[PDB]
Amino acid sequence: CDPENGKKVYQICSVCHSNDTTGVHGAAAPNLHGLEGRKVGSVPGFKFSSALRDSGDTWTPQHLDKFLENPMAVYPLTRMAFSGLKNEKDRRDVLCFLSKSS
Ligand code: HEC
């Protein structure tokens, strides 16, 4: 995993999402600070779709990788309008950039 490539890949997420210490969500999507290991659809102050609002899943690396590859294959009714990252390197790299160690 190359977190440097990951930061570049992440530019596709950064208009919808925020990712900072402020707790404030992005223009269209939740703050991704603290994502790794977080319960799905739980960060306060963001109105999730019913699928994510009602989920008991956790954003493990394995669950995040599946979701980034094809969001509606994991949560069909999601409001995330994103086709998915089909390149395995780009998924692993952006996950690496999104890790707590980053
Ligand atoms: C706008 C067009 C988006 C782009 C581009 C990306 N995401 Fe997104 N994401 C978006 C919305 C509107 C939502 C909420 C969905 C719902 O059904 O309520 C999300 C949600 C996520 C989550 C779940 C967060 C949680 O706290 O459970 C994750 C992990 C996520 N998005 C990641 C992500 C990444 C890594 C992206 C770039 C590759 C990305 N999103 C793009 C809107 C949009």
Author numbering: 3 to 104
Paper text:
The first two steps in the pathway are catalyzed by the enzymes nicotine oxidoreductase (NicA2) and pseudooxynicotine amine oxidase (Pnao), which convert nicotine into pseudooxynicotine (Pon) and Pon into 3-succinoylsemialdehyde-pyridine, respectively. Both NicA2 and Pnao are members of the widespread flavin-dependent amine oxidase enzyme family. Enzymes of this family use a flavin adenine dinucleotide (FAD) prosthetic group to accept a hydride from their amine containing substrate, forming an oxidized product and reduced flavin hydroquinone (FADH2) in the reductive half reaction. However, our lab recently demonstrated that NicA2 is instead a dehydrogenase that uses a cytochrome c protein (called CycN) as a biological oxidant.
We were able to solve the structure of CycN at 1.9 Å, and the structure has a similar overall fold as bovine cytochrome c. We used rigid-body docking between CycN and Pnao and NicA2 and LHNO via the ZDOCK server to gain insight into how CycN may interact with these proteins. The ZDOCK server returns the top 10 docking poses as an output, and for Pnao, all 10 docking poses had CycN positioned in the same spot on the surface of Pnao. Docking CycN with the structure of NicA2 produced similar results, with eight of the top 10 docking poses having CycN positioned at the same relative location as that seen in the Pnao docking poses. Interestingly, this was not observed when we performed docking of CycN with LHNO; in that case, CycN was distributed across several positions on the surface of LHNO, with only one of the top 10 docking poses showing CycN at the common region observed with NicA2 and Pnao. This observation is consistent with the fact that LHNO reacts poorly with CycN and suggests that this common docking position observed with NicA2 and Pnao may correspond to the true CycN binding site for these enzymes. For example, Pnao contains Ser91, Phe98, Ser100, and Tyr422 on the surface of this potential binding site, and NicA2 contains identical residues at these positions. We previously observed that NicA2 and nicotine were unable to reduce bovine cytochrome c and noted that bovine cytochrome c has a much more positively charged surface than CycN on the heme-containing side of the protein. Yeast cytochrome c also has a similarly positively charged surface, and this difference in surface charge between CycN and bovine and yeast cytochrome c may, in part, be responsible for Pnao and NicA2’s specificity for CycN as a cytochrome c-based electron acceptor. Given how buried FAD is in the structure of Pnao, we suspect that CycN binds on the surface of Pnao, and the electrons on Pnao’s flavin are transferred to CycN over longer distances.
